[model samples]
Target: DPMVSKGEELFTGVVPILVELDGDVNGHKFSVRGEGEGDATNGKLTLKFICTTGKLPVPWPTLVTTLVLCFARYPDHMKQHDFFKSAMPEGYVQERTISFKDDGYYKTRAEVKFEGDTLVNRIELKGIDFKEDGNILGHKLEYNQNSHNAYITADKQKNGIKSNFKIRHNVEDGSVQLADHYQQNTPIGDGPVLLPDNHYLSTQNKLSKDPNEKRDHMVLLEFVTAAGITLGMDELYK
Candidate 1:
């Protein structure tokens, strides 16, 4: 409920702007011109809330940090819950997206941080699941990994758009955040019901509205510890 109210509001504002600036939401390929003022949630606080690390530039580095942050950031209930809202079996509302690049496509994971009294963090995006004839394609893994744009767009900047907004209410009021972010998904909901491989959480009720389609994918993360430096799925699921 909490993620929904905020997610919807934030999405309304961001998606339009992003589409106008970038393009359609296909394959996890899009771009947001950095405002430079940085996130309203204060880059520092955002990093702490997500526990981001500077060394997490590579795929594996970010993957390990992702696992740790997943459990540490959200409540137990939200952590295991996937899909924003569905109809087939009836599920929760979740985010979905795809990224495209010059060479190949990718699955995107992104967030928008709102800085204010009661900072709001809103995120959205597609899972790492590619579909072939209704069944999930396992090779895609759980990531839309393509860094060509990061370097290409690294120097690109945009302005003249007011991105931050404030909210007021009788009970509790603050800012709203929305983003198309992703969490490496699994083949099917694995593990126990109490704590599944539910990584990505969306602002929607469930996720995709389509039935007979599963967005669940797999992206095992590994860290190149010590001399190896070859990226290993850091056994951090404890």
Candidate 2:
């Protein structure tokens, strides 16, 4: 069983981190922070962002927040298959579908596959069929098996701009970064910008063996808030 220490009961479903985020986007430096008071089971969690240098463009911060929140509640199957060993649940088929719903409409979809009991592969936001006014109209994420990376592309509903991004994960070191592009193949920078995935990914797995590593409930809340912005579920401020 996973060992529990003092005050561990309060953060049942939360990743126990105070405020952690570091990255740069389009020459602008931005950071994310999270704060919480008391236990997380039903407690309050708040997340905020600040542009330390340069001016933040419209919707860029929103996109960052959305990605953060999206990864926070990143499904167990996806996490296992991508970062750790994946195990299929009993009485299930070779594949399973996970859906994210906003109100009554489906916002995003992920398909996970398994070979026997082992998770073989998975895909996120596979189809671009979701419809929301002034949001991402056509969104699809493709997986690169050879490089163990992900390419996410979408069409902005408002401006009809082709949005492209890539997520690269260094499985050996547990390092993750998000890179942007001008189009499907155009590179915005020579290399990808780093994101705070150490605590959320690598350190997170150590919690079972290291009781000192705790997950903060605010982490997921902040990430989800950012995801909401991408789906047009929330505004940038308030």
Candidate 3:
């Protein structure tokens, strides 16, 4: 599922999001594009992995910065580890989405900065913590005073996607040195024996298996963190 096709819009200015990616990775056939201007905390995102065609392999772009750090945030052990083999790309994908017209869609505390712009893969995700480790993480001095009722009881009905996280990717000028993978075992072999920096991450826009799209049906994630199980591939990735 190379993302095939998708397009959305929601604006109020200063929130420019433009992320694109084509299919078939390691075995060639590629395409990458990125440009996200901020909001929801802080902003500025850029990308241009060059290869509008092929042969740009070998971590040479961390494959769109590891598909923008597993886009929508860590969806199921990143497709079962091995750096998201998922059979190394299947083919055909294109998308352009935009957001930032806040009425509090529940977007979280971010600090975006994933640069590339033709080279030197710039990176920055200073603080991508999506709180709520588990046990349904519900208890904020009786559901916050006023923050949309603590975002409807910790991201809707207690369980902000198995929170308790720490995603701080730093590569400002380090010439790109990213090799961090933690998941000692949490495929729900038991339930939640976390501590590999367990953060299931979240962000999903209703269910849309294409079929010619069906209006973005809410739940569009500002930050929901993640946690999988119960059928698996949890936290959904709209």
lDDT of 2 by residue, 70-139 (tens): 1223332233211111111111111112122320111221222222322111212122233332122221
> Considering TM-score, where higher is better, how would the candidates rank from best to worst?
2, 3, 1
Q: Candidate 2, which ten residues in sequence have the lowest lDDT sum? A: 84-93
Q: For candidate 1, lDDT tens digit of each residue in 67-180? A: 211111233233222121111011122222322111122233333222331222233323343333211222222222221100000011220011111111111122211122
Best by TM-score: 2
- Model 2, which residues run further than 4 Å from truth? 1-17, 37-39, 58-238
Which sections of candidate 1 miss by over 4 Å? 1-111, 115-121, 126-129, 133-136, 139-149, 152-157, 160-238
lDDT per model vs. reference: 0.21, 0.24, 0.24
Give the range of the ten consecutive residues with the poorest summed lDDT in model 3: 143-152
To one decimal, what is the Cα RMSD in angstroms of model 3 from the true structure?
21.4
lDDT (tens digit, per residue) of candidate 3 on 137-226 = 111111111111000012223212122222222233322232222211112122221122223334321111224523211111223223
Q: Report clashes for each candidate as comma-separated counts.
A: 41, 12, 6
Q: TM-score of every model?
A: 0.20, 0.24, 0.21
Error of 1 at 209 (Å): 30
* Model 3: number of backbone collisions: 6
